């Protein structure tokens, strides 16, 4: 298992514009297009991302291409973030994947907001961090996905995904 497979499990794949769990326009493998309520605006962002007139529908290869960019950007975003980098550097391979997942989903700013859990992860206090992570809107809104990510941090294994 790896980050790509993990996120493909958490986000799914949709080839037509859809609304995410928050009601935002998305496409592919969790690629947010816009927070604006307007479908046109969504379509416009889509065309600009793909580089052709898509009419709201993309192919599988296009979806995977956005996906590669988004994962790459997430990693690079962690590495540039003063608060995140040190956490990431401190972790093992499995748990690094858990942190990338969260950043892909909520953005770096959002993750950097879990200050306490981050310190706990850096200190390798697994159980405590897991409890702290669960007390968040994130967990209350997407509990099953959150639970998977949190077990991964707790255990350092991919069991939640097998
Ligand atoms: Cl883009
Ligand atoms: Cl969920």
From Swiss-Prot:
Function (record text): Endolysin with lysozyme activity that degrades host peptidoglycans and participates with the holin and spanin proteins in the sequential events which lead to the programmed host cell lysis releasing the mature viral particles. Once the holin has permeabilized the host cell membrane, the endolysin can reach the periplasm and break down the peptidoglycan layer.
PANTHER family: T4-TYPE LYSOZYME 1-RELATED
Family that this chain belongs to: Belongs to the glycosyl hydrolase 24 family.
Protein's recorded name: Endolysin
GO molecular function, one term: lysozyme activity
Impact reported for residue 11 to A/F/H/M/N: Complete loss of enzymatic activity
pH dependence of function: Optimum pH is 7.3.
InterPro entries named in the record: Endolysin_T4_type (IPR034690), Glyco_hydro_24 (IPR002196), Lysozyme-like_dom_sf (IPR023346), Lysozyme_dom_sf (IPR023347), Phage_lysozyme-like (IPR052619), T4-type_lysozyme (IPR001165)
Reaction equation(s) it catalyzes: Hydrolysis of (1->4)-beta-linkages between N-acetylmuramic acid and N-acetyl-D-glucosamine residues in a peptidoglycan and between N-acetyl-D-glucosamine residues in chitodextrins
Compartmental location: Host cytoplasm
Induction summary: Expressed late in the viral replication.
SUPFAM superfamilies: Lysozyme-like (SSF53955)
CDD domains, sorted: T4-like_lys (cd00735)
Effect of residue 132 to I: 5-fold decrease in enzymatic activity
Result of changing residue 11 to N: Loss of 84% of enzymatic activity
Main location as per UniProt: host cell
Keyword list, A-Z: Antimicrobial, Bacteriolytic enzyme, Cytolysis, Glycosidase, Host cell lysis by virus, Host cytoplasm, Hydrolase, Viral release from host cell
Annotated GO biological process: cell wall macromolecule catabolic process; defense response to bacterium; peptidoglycan catabolic process; viral release from host cell by cytolysis
Sequence positions that bind substrate: 32, 104, 117, 132
Gene that encodes it: E
Source species of the chain: Enterobacteria phage T4
HAMAP family on file: ENDOLYSIN_T4 (MF_04110)
């Amino acid at each position: 298992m790896n980050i790509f497979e993990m996120l493909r499990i958490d986000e799914g794949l949709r080839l037509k514009i859809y609304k995410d769990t928050e009601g935002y326009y998305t496409i592919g493998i969790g690629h947010l297009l816009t927070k604006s309520p307007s479908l046109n605006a969504a379509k416009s962002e889509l065309d600009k991302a793909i580089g052709r007139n898509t009419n709201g529908v993309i192919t599988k290869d296009e979806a995977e291409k956005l996906f590669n960019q988004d994962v790459d950007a997430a990693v690079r975003g962690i590495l540039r973030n003063a608060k995140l980098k040190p956490v990431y550097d401190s972790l093992d391979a499995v748990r690094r994947a858990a942190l990338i997942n969260m950043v892909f989903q909520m953005g770096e700013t959002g993750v950097a907001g879990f200050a306490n859990a981050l310190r706990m992860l850096q200190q390798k206090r697994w159980d405590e961090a897991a409890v702290n992570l669960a007390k968040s809107r994130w967990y209350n809104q997407t509990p099953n996905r959150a639970k998977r990510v949190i077990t991964t941090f707790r255990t350092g294994t991919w069991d939640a995904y097998k």
